[PDB]
């Protein structure tokens, strides 16, 4: 039984910077991938961010540089930071963990446990 | 880059029957030795989505033996048997062959 | 379908017996700053009464006595050679033997003082719980009993500080109640074993055999209480009552001090430790054909992914003289590594830690779904389950490798 | 036509020397139940006089005497280190030198009681069939003679029974008539000092120097005979005679008690054993290009096919302190294996025991048409014949692998 | 030099069990194959069975389901057991010692050591 | 599964002369790097057979240097340069490439 | 463009400290005729003051001295273990510290006479050209100094010849004028404890504490001077004055006999040797996409060409009990070789001396022209030029190799 | 800073045996190639002989059986002997020190240092 | 075997100008990965020659950065940018691809 939690921000004015923190309880973060995804009425599901535990990062081609992700193992959490949020970026955020197998490459399994999610809303 | 496309978006099915959902891609989406790089996800309304199918064939933990995936190349599908009122919700296809991981337009499973 | 794959360096261990080595800040290796690596979710069984710690350790301490001949005992440490580890429990309610869930791994044991005591353990390390009862089987009445305390009592010479005894007794028997359900009295053994019935220790290099009867017999202590001692007005030495040794005298029941020997004392002062041997080789099924121990106990896949190459194969000796035991241990470790590397080289597996081979995987070996092997089953118990067929698996792997 | 092929697991041996282990149940490891492996057909050249075992016997026993400074001499076996072997000649008419046919291999020697004695060997293993004579050269008067007995006679000390004594002397004389063609008489030494003339041994912790002059100065005991002895109101010594030491001076030829130093004693008991080096590397001509020592007398084909992959390097004790000599042997063995493995891997034939290489077979090396290579010659004979050109073969193999 | 010997039955009527024993009086069984050859006044020399020393066995298709082979080690023999001998299977039997050579393959040399052979008759 | 064919079945040669025997196979008797997989045997009348030629080229112990021969593919042959009255008898050629080993039809040698 | 390539067997070394093993003719490993290999044009800095080998030699001579608890001091030929080298400077004005050319390499050191002396070195190894002065800092620190002589002066018993003393004093004063400006004449000790104030030595089993004061002051001799002392006539002892220990007490200047300690006594000879560690692994740029130390100090090309297969692991003794230090060294050497071979084997460079792999050469590592790299710079300077990035280049090499 | 030196031989009549010797002063003959080169007024430059330290030698096809080349490590020098010198070989000889690079095949760098070169005519 | 030919034999160049030489061989000079197997030397009148270009691209120490090289196959060319009274002399190509070495004809470079 492993669980995830998120600390988030409420309503944001357009074009400023907002950060989302997300912590894990129950299992260490040494042997997985941690990713953030977002959902919206007009877009479905689109991948955003991926990170290992040493600090290897990976981002989508759309928001290649407009967002950054960081991790820390002292209290075992990670975080996103997104600058200049706009109206078209209506996005409810989810934390999740990809499981891995090493046979020839880092082959991927499903994303088993999903965080509750924060209804990050942007308005003027 | 990579774009999914699945059918049907919504279907009307009698309770306890079987439904098949087919999603297609634009790239080959086939492993050199492995089975596939596609996953099938399920979301209940207003809750965090769970896992159904990983690698396209096997099932996850705690999922009933009512979901089975198959296909190859640029077409994949999921068969679902003995549907219940609990499972009414949204099914999503996920792709992993290349970078820029991308879902597709989700499908709505509703009971007639 | 499913095909066999070799993993090297995977953290799975097993119980084993081996010669440890002494060190000190007959044996004088240097002792660096130690460190403890915690483990995530491993459950490990511990047993003090079936252990080789006492045998090797007691042999070493007797050798030190013989080599000595006017000295004070010096704290020492024990450490494992390359290829082993020391597991120690942390639960404050450790009932001598049983499972533990807070298990830490170390390379060098904590400080132990080689002091000898017979009836009352002196200069001993404490415990968090107020009082603990340790035995192999307290109900069987065929073994001795160790009582471990929380507040050490100062003993000069000899003298004891009065009421501190009384209150102490007022706790001890209380716990004993919830084990035997009767009022408990005490008395000397009424035997002729003058070497054990009498209390024994040493100070300043001089032995001390002291009579003791009022410590363990009720129906008045009040101020400081005194006892006869022979070989009290000759030499003033101090000591720490930390633990005591009690046995059952075959309604109210009587206990008896002094039942035991030196080995029981030594076990009482060092019991949280267990020697374990790592076996870095694993066989697992997947779809392919052509630091340490940190992740152990976690998911099989997560342990697999964190497995990375190492510059070192399989401390801080600097440029000292290892001695006989270190040299033997190093030779054994290096030959074990050579043997294992030859075993890997027998197959077409020429150096990679991750090794995919062409051998079919049948349903008899596992009878476990592919999902449950790499998402739920930890490495240690997976190896424990597959151990029944390891030799057959190795032989089939070699046969399908050389025959091509 | 033919091309060089490299075999690794080959049963061929050569002559060499080394140290050993002190099996005994100081150098005191354990000793489990041994086993003896026969050889189907090997003619082996034994030589007890040149043997290097006696030197190690004398050095180790002398070290034991110094360590002790009632002896209760434990039958002590000498165990060969890893990678070596001990050969025992089982033929029952063996003069200690020459060919032997019934040659077997054994890991650890039979029990030897290192009892010091002279002019009368005591507590030694008897002869299997009949009394015999051991000598380096019967025609060399500077050499000594060992007379080995078949029916031991007990002597109580001294008090000796004469009924068996003169019969044993008669049998000895009759046998010596075969080797020497004159009537033989015996006469006491009248030597220089105490040790070369009297009988020497030790019993129950004290030494005995006895006046044994009356047992050979034949001109009728017809009963028990008493010999003077000094250091009867003494502890008795009833040790049994196993053989005697006999020497000649300069046609009534005279034989002479006395002889050489203490060394010859261990020559009278450790003459059946030889220490032998295993050299697992073979070169053979084949039409291809791109346990151990068990069947070492079989044909090339049989020994080649019986070669299978081992799972051990190149075993009696367990978790025991080894000592200086054991560590020496183990480190030397592992270094030899590493050197040989690197040598084999230089040609790319690393993992496979059998390797065919791309080198033409210079017919001038051996002649010996291919038919007789694998149908008539033993492996050891093949190595003996090819030893003249092994270095050139190795160099050419390395050069051709380098050229690619 | 090495020699072979055989023991067997005399007159045997059909549908019974034929047991033939063959002993070796030379080098051990470790490094060869022992093989049985059959000669008859009809159709010529044939092949019956092949045995190693571990117990690995090989048979022909003609008599796959009717003949079996056994070996031991204490006294160095090997043995045929053939069920339901028919009238058309009458055949003198020979033991022989195949030599072998190891070069990446079990290269099979000639069969030099041949037993003297024994006559076998059929009862009717 | 493999059938030999010997030629001739019987020939009558003057003593001390040279004779040649040839037998055909149904498959190629060629090793990857070796010579062949064929055997040549004698049989005296009423006596146990003995080895003559192994691996198609060489001769065994005690074999006089009058026996030779070679071949390839689906044709092999044996040769005698000098024949004696002692060697009157039979010669057989044997196959070993596949599992189903099989002899030939016998070659009887008789002196004029 | 340019790609990295690994060479195994490069003659490059670095300063290191290790247990040099004792050897003599408690040290019986024997030694055959030694050989010295000259090095062409290597320039090596020597610092005898910070040498660690003398530290190991001391307290080992002390252990040997204590073990006997008369002595004909055997020349103890210290020698290096496997995988190490002893560099011997060979200049005539080397004075102990600084750069040296003509630097030769030798396996086993020169004969050493471990004779105790305090103020006058006895039976010390002579100088080669002229008297010399050695100090750690002649001017910046008032520390003890060593004076090395040319013609050893024979003294007996205690009994010295005046003319030679006057000549040596005159030459020493003239030489010291070259370093210190003031007039140098030697005054008496005027010190404290008699251990470091008088003359101390031992001879034929007897210690001698001779109060010597006429060898200084004299602000004369005209014959034989006599200085008897105590612990029949005195034993006819004899000795060779070879070197004198002096110390300044901060015009007219005053050196002082004695002072310092006995480490300085054993440093008066072992100042010509340094212990160095071979590191046979190098990387260099070239064009690809797929005995020892003799050439060191020569151009890159010659050393690359002469690097051929050693066909050995990386000596003098033959079948001898090695002891603790030998076996320690051998185990360490074999472990180092195994570690290095595993490190090389992580890539495809497994069985080849040279191996060139697929990694682009980042120009920031060297910033040197290819001609300059492979035509002008010796290996030892190249390793220093790359030592700043060895770890990262190794990691990049492994990362690029394991991708495929 | 290395130098090459050579020892003159004066004039020789045709059909004679002429030996030329060349010594070195500098780095030892460890891992370089020592070769000679001839110069003529009307023939250009042609190659003659090559030697290593181990004694292995290489020659040109034009002088298969006319000259032989050898070395002496003790004096750190080398030489050749030319039998039957002809009147058509008016020559000037030069010593040369080819560098080498050991990467797979022994790659052949240039010829850095050159001896002063010696005159050799044929007397008649 | 191999004949080195080059153009031109003589040059009439102004001071400090650039001059180019082109030498052709009988076959290719290309290593599997190396730039070439060609040497490019210069000699002064009456003095011993020295190295200019080794492996066709680099220059040894003591060579001014005015000499350059290029080419492949059967044509290799060499370039000088600035010349002076020092550089007058004889430029030579040298060939080492095969076991036979040959300089070929010389190139007399002089100044008007
Ligand atoms: C007390 O110790 C016994 C073994 O003597 C063990 O079985 C039991 O679990 C322990 N009680 C605990 C841990 O509460
Ligand atoms: C010991 O402590 C108990 C506490 O309940 C007290 O009743 C009793 O009087 C004490 N006895 C003495 C001798 O102090
Ligand atoms: C187990 O593996 C063996 C491989 O020899 C195979 O023969 C057997 O059929 C397998 N078990 C099952 C139940 O298939
Ligand atoms: C023992 O017999 C062998 C057999 O050849 C012989 O060589 C040897 O000389 C005999 N021993 C003696 C002592 O004669
Ligand atoms: C022993 O020799 C014969 C054997 O019977 C016997 O008659 C004789 O008396 C005995 N002699 C001695 C000296 O023992
Ligand atoms: C010597 O004492 C032993 C002790 O058992 C006895 O057997 C033996 O007969 C005694 N011998 C004599 C001569 O007294
Ligand atoms: C001496 O050896 C004989 C030979 O069998 C034996 O009977 C006797 O018991 C031995 N002596 C002793 C004291 O055991
Ligand atoms: C010793 O020689 C070194 C060589 O550089 C020099 O630096 C130093 O000053 C010299 N010292 C003495 C005392 O000669
Ligand atoms: C020492 O020698 C010098 C030589 O210049 C001489 O002047 C002086 O008198 C001598 N002193 C003694 C004491 O011999």
Numbering used by the authors:
A (entry chain C), E (entry chain A), H (entry chain E): 1 to 124
B (entry chain D), F (entry chain B), I (entry chain F): 1 to 112
C (entry chain Y), D (entry chain Z), G (entry chain X): 33 to 57, 73 to 116, 219 to 306, 331 to 353, 356 to 394, 409 to 420, 440 to 458, 464 to 503, ...
The paper states:
While the primary way out of the HIV-1 epidemic is an effective vaccine, the development of such preventives is marked by frequent setbacks, largely due to the inherently high mutation rates of HIV-1 genomes and the immune evasion capacity of the viral envelope glycoprotein (Env), which is the sole target of host humoral immune response and thus the focus of HIV-1 vaccine design. Despite its essential role in mediating HIV-1 host entry, most antigenic surfaces on Env are either hypervariable or cloaked by an evolving glycan shield. Here, we present the cryo-EM structures of Envs from two Asia prevalent CRFs (CRF01_AE and CRF07_BC) at 3.0 and 3.5 Å. We also solve a 4.1 Å cryo-EM structure of CRF01_AE Env in complex with F6, the first bNAb from CRF01_AE-infected individuals.
After extensive cryogenic condition optimization, we were able to reconstitute a 4.14 Å cryo-EM map of X18 UFO-F6 complex wherein three F6 bind one X18 UFO trimer. In the reconstituted cryo-EM map, the density of the Env apex proximal regions (V1/V2/V3 and part of C4, V4, V5) is shattered and untraceable, indicating high flexibility. In gp41, we observed a 6.3 Å movement of α8 helix and 5.6 Å movement of α6 helix, plus a de-spiral at the C-terminus of α6 in F6-bound state as compared to 8ANC195-bound state (close-up views). In F6-bound state, although the interactions among α7 helices remain largely unchanged, the movement of α6 towards F6 and its de-spiral break the hydrophobic (e.g., L595 and aliphatic part of R542*, * denotes elements from neighbor protomer) and hydrophilic (e.g., E648 and R542*) inter-protomer packings between α7/α9 and α6* helices (compare right to left). To summarize, the F6-induced positional and conformational changes in α6 and α9 helices destabilize the interactions among the Env protomers at the base end. Consequently, the F6-bound gp41 trimer displays a 9.2o clockwise rotation and ~5 Å dilation at the base end, as compared to 8ANC195-bound state. In gp120, a large outward movement (relative to the trimer axis) was observed in the β4¯/β26 sheets (region boxed in black). Notably, the gp120 protomer displays clockwise rotation from the sideview upon F6 binding (rotational movement indicated with arrows), which likely transmits the disengagement of protomers near the base all the way to the apex and eventually leads to the destabilization of the apex proximal regions (V1/V2/V3 and part of C4, V4, V5). Hence, the binding of F6 weakens the inter-protomer packings at both the base and the apex of Env trimer, leading to the possibility of inducing Env trimer disassembly. Notably, F6-induced disassembly was also observed for Q769 Env (subtype A).
